[PDB]
Amino acid sequence: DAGYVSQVIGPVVDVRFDGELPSILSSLEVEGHSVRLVLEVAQHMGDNTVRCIAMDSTDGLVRGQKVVDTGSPIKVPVGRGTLGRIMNVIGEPVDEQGPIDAADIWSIHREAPEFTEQSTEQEILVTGIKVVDLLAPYQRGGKIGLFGGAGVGKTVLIMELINNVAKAHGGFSVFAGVGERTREGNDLYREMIESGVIKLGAERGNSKCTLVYGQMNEPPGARARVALTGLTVAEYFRDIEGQDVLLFVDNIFRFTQANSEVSALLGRIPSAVGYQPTLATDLGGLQERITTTTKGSITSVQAVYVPADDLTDPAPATTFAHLDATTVLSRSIAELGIYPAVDPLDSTSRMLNPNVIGAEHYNVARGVQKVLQDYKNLQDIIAILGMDELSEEDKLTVARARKIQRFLSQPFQVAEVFTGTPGKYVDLADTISGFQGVLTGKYDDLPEMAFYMVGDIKEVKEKADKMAKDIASRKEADNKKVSEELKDIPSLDKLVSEIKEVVIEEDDGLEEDFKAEALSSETVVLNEEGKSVPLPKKN
Amino acid sequence: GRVLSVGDGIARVYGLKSVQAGELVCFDSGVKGMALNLQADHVGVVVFGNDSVIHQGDLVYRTGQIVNVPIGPGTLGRVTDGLGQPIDGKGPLTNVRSSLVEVKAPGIIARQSVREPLFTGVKAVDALVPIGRGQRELIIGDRQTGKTAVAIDAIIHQKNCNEQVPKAQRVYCVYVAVGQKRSTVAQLVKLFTQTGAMRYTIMVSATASDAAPLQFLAPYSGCAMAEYFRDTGKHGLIIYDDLSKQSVAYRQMSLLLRRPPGREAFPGDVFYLHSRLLERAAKLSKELGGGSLTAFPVIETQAGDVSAYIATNVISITDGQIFLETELFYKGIRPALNVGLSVSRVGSAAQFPGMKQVAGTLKLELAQYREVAAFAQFGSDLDAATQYVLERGARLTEMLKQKQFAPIPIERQTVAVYAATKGFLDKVRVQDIVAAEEAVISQVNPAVFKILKANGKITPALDAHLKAELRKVKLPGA
Amino acid sequence: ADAKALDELRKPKFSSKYLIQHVSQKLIPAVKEWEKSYQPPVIHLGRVLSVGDGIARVYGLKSVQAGELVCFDSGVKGMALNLQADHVGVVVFGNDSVIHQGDLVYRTGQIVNVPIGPGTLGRVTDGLGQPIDGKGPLTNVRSSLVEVKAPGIIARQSVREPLFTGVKAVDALVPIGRGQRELIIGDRQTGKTAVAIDAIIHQKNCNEQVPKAQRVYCVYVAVGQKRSTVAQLVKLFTQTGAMRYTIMVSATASDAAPLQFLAPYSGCAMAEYFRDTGKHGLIIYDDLSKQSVAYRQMSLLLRRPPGREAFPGDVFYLHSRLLERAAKLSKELGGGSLTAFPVIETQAGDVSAYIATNVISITDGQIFLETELFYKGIRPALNVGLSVSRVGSAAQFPGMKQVAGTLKLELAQYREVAAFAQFGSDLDAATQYVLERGARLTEMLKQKQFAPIPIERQTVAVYAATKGFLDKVRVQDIVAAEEAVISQVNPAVFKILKANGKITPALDAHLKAELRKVKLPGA
Ligand SMILES: Nc1ncnc2c1ncn2[C@@H]1O[C@H](COP(=O)(O)OP(=O)(O)OP(=O)(O)O)[C@@H](O)[C@H]1O
Ligand SMILES: Nc1ncnc2c1ncn2[C@@H]1O[C@H](COP(=O)(O)OP(=O)(O)OP(=O)(O)O)[C@@H](O)[C@H]1O
Ligand SMILES: Nc1ncnc2c1ncn2[C@@H]1O[C@H](COP(=O)(O)OP(=O)(O)O)[C@@H](O)[C@H]1O
């Protein structure tokens, strides 16, 4: 019928069974624990023993405790009521609003959608970031990748992409938090209640998003399957409902790391540099479930933390085959102070072809690639020469190229809480010819930084007008200034007579609810009969 | 055989007193399997599919046969999985025959020296780093750089060549997709249908979504499909794409099966499992069938390291390298074929003699250009025996640019590179580029292309017309 | 040879019993002739099979859990990290020399608990609750769960409180928060202890001003620091008075591994109490790489599989829940805070080091301290172009926040033109002036070790280089001109800006006049 935990090694525990062993990728439950604990079996030991992975911390499992079989894979409650809910890996409410108002639980482990039901019709997903929509154009229902180091600006692109595409769609979306910080988790909960994507009250059914959160605090059972828990509710809305759902998964690398933290612990030799031996079927099984079929559409948005901007590690080097549109973030362009710091060379999508979009889109983005590759091949030699002997034919594809690295920049709506400048929702054909102009020489007349953090071709000519005036401004130093006391300025002590009286009490309020109990001077132990005794005094 | 321990797509079975090494077994729940290693007490069995169906104590039946794939002409146009089943949704594969995927390569006396050339449409491949019918050439590169593009534009060129070439010497395509997405192959099944190449192509696509040994077996079965076109005497093109993922396949099973790890945790014999693949495609001699087989493996590097362990093997067993760098790809030379890094072993020994007297200088003039390539970012001029060569190199960049999915016929790219090195070049400025590239290939009469494909070489009864035809380059857009 | 053959072996098929009648008669005199050589059968207790070096392997113990404190028979405390099939691997707190093959192991049943509360303010324990400061046991304290998971998503709010460090190199250049996880990653001997101790002495001399609801108490966790350095910092905390509002858990390098492994964990167990009861808490996890080496010692004796640099698999999860339990709660649980300082020493410049890539991805902002910048006069040697934060505005002083954009972006161009000094250009009055500006900005932003200067003096001190008042002053003597800018101005204007908090035009008129009233000694 049921079995017992026989062995605990950190975050993997071993359950023995007396006949009819559970199928692989089923769910187990322990009774008498603090929280409900789900064990997901990964391999059979051989001696009537499954080997598990732990959805929460194992600190507390006694050897021999009762383990029941649910006989079935992990079931999350899918449904239309799940919108506006912050969801766990194992189906829990962690936003503390009752149970999940949904039915028809579904197995979150399945096979990939087959080869026959594959979509090849491609639609350009216009986002609103001038480096995305020109250079690496995303695909509707396709894949969106995001690499970059820890501190280059990956996650602030993701919520910016939510404000771009997940608001102006009307349908449903899903934010799949896989092992990121709670800070960028909790802040996104506030900036979707205020932006109205997630609602509270009796309007829970008209919302647009579910949040599946497997953040960094959980042990790697939960950080390894929150990718699948966020995935299957997106694949539930695809096949049953037909709506296009946007999957915003964060830190796909943390999905592959959470596998790799216990993959050695299940009895496997480490692979290349120390990552997991089975990363191919782990990630390849993850990715090809995220597609768009004949029945519906899933537009995957993937953020990946890469360690120290090195793309030779095999845990992101399997991901490059698995992403059509890739927005590779360079720390160098952020060290230039340019946001978004999207690489003009490393970030290249699959929509970029004149056989689909049109020659007017493909030629300027290729024209961007000529002027920016040669700018990289010349900024090595500009430090030996200083750009003074080039005979005025290589001083044209440089001066525009120093401008075009600023013309990838844009103030963000989600970032204006800490940058001050208001964000732009930029369209496509207005800036393609705008990108085309500064490549051609129509805007050679302008200075350097007028291109920085702007939008259309109207705002670049109007940053120079303000900039040109500001070189005519601050041309005075004499008198009639703020520094005199004649106009409105009080004396220095009459500021001080409006200060509010701040009380200091020196005892700080620390003995009001703290139950200042006593602790034992001698360590308390148990006896063989189990009752509490002090230590029997003998070595 | 009963299963003791099963996990991660690896089932360790007990029993099976007569199972063979590499024998294809079958489980209870319809999923097949192969036993790779056979130990004293338990036998290790790798699993071709999902592994969450087998409990402990299930049963395995031996089929008594080493793993085989259905080979033959009925596979043409179908999209199969690597084990030998179709996934296209077009029902079964009829007019086929099953044959063993594991045999030995052709020996010494089976071989004949590769002399006649394969033509692959990309002029940067055909003229600079050429490829013979029955030859091994590695499309190495970065990712997002066009290794699939050099593969598929060769395939579309064969369909652009097979319609005007007789029945025997028609080059059939088996592009084997290893580790690509299940949605990328959907684009590739579209491009072979829309162009019409699906009369000639067999798309073996073991994805990233299936289990480990399917990605391991997809090159052997795909080369076993290439075995059928060899001993029938036809000519065949076999392409493995992203063979590094097949190395990720042979890594993933070896460490799961507790075989001893070697360099970068790959097994030691992974060089042998790459060689018996790539030594299977060759040119059989005129006593044993006369057919050929040319293999185009693909290795995806990381940042251009050609000394990584997996690339170290394939460069050693194959002949040359078509190095496709990502950085110079945005420098407009399409494909980014680093001629100083990309060599083929045969050189001019196996090239069509309409190119031989002009590729025999083209690797010499590009040698003069790459030795002087640091000067193009300098305005201060040298003696103009350098700077004319810098423009002889510059109009030999855009001389080699190839539009995507558009292979050009073989005798057209012969006279086009004849129109740059001989000196009928675009001396006027690069404001007008669009009528300086296409003018040679469109404004001459099409009698001259008919002659060059018949005789094999620019005879001296043609150069006076050919110098005259390039002289009246029209360019009506000036 | 299967288990059904084993269950068939449970059915007796002996067909004769011509031994069992007699071997049952000579069994009991045999076991009672050799009775002295029998240790008793032990079920809910434990007894040691193998012991060594901090990992002791104990037979039995059917009652224990993972993470239960056990007590050996000599009084030594222990911890059950993994539980194998027949035995339980027990990690040993302290020296392990007293344990033999055959000694008793007593289960205490509880999860490991170190005493928490405000009575510990002024005490230095180790990671186990035992006092080393020579002031006896802890009074008015209580035990708490050190293995507790972090506060959830519904429990947190957006951070607002800036957490002034008292350092102009920090508060102007890297915005810190009160619930922000700030990493100090550098080389060895480069000022990492300098930046952390500058924050606490500032937070003590700004603790006797703020009214009960921004009072940031500090716990400084010493992992592997030698015991003279522990007496050094106790001497530093006492001789300014900071020890009144300072707890310090101090795991030396001459202690065992798991006392160093638990000391940041017990270090945050104190500071969760300051977060739970509404106050603000400072925590510094000093030498957090050396705590991870203290993790690597235990596992590699524990027959556990190694990975990158022979560190185990789950070492990301170690530093994750060590730095996720520091937070800023919502209004519904007091509104308390915790702000985090982990210290990671690079292996002389490996940012791709295995511990580094974990802790740079967990934490919110990082502060690079190269050994390059430490000898160019820049002390503390903060890297500006490589240091990022998250929350930006509403994480600095708000009057500083407007002038910080004038400070950061001019520093952004200056780091690009500083390496272009190989030609002697100084062209068009801009390639010299941004060199003239940013060099004085570097000579602005140096300070002294152990000199906590409040932000209100720094919002004036940041104004001296952003405006004029320094456009005629050399690159040699700004470090003795800044103090005369501090001294000769009216000492009442600093209080009213910290009272205001923002640069109003009502106060902007005074701040332009008073910096020409001062006369600079750089000449
Ligand atoms: N001649 C060309 N002109 C413009 N773009 C091209 C050309 N050739 C290839 N590309 C670009 O290459 C991209 C993908 O081609 P391909 O799949 O061959 O590259 P790849 O190196 O195989 O990439 P991956 O290895 O990631 O699959 C497309 O986005 C396409 O825009
Ligand atoms: N801001 C500073 N100004 C002047 N000297 C400093 C400064 N910071 C550090 N030092 C010098 O550096 C030495 C070490 O200081 P500190 O312990 O802060 O560095 P650390 O990198 O934390 O050292 P460790 O790596 O050993 O912990 C001190 O002896 C002091 O002389
Ligand atoms: N467009 C932008 N505007 C303002 N700040 C930006 C922009 N892009 C990136 N940043 C900065 O980059 C920093 C890192 O952001 P985040 O996405 O959290 O990085 P990571 O994904 O590496 O953790 C943020 O603090 C943010 O302020």
Ligand SMILES: [Mg+2]
């Ligand atoms: Mg490819």
Ligand SMILES: [Mg+2]
């Ligand atoms: Mg120190």
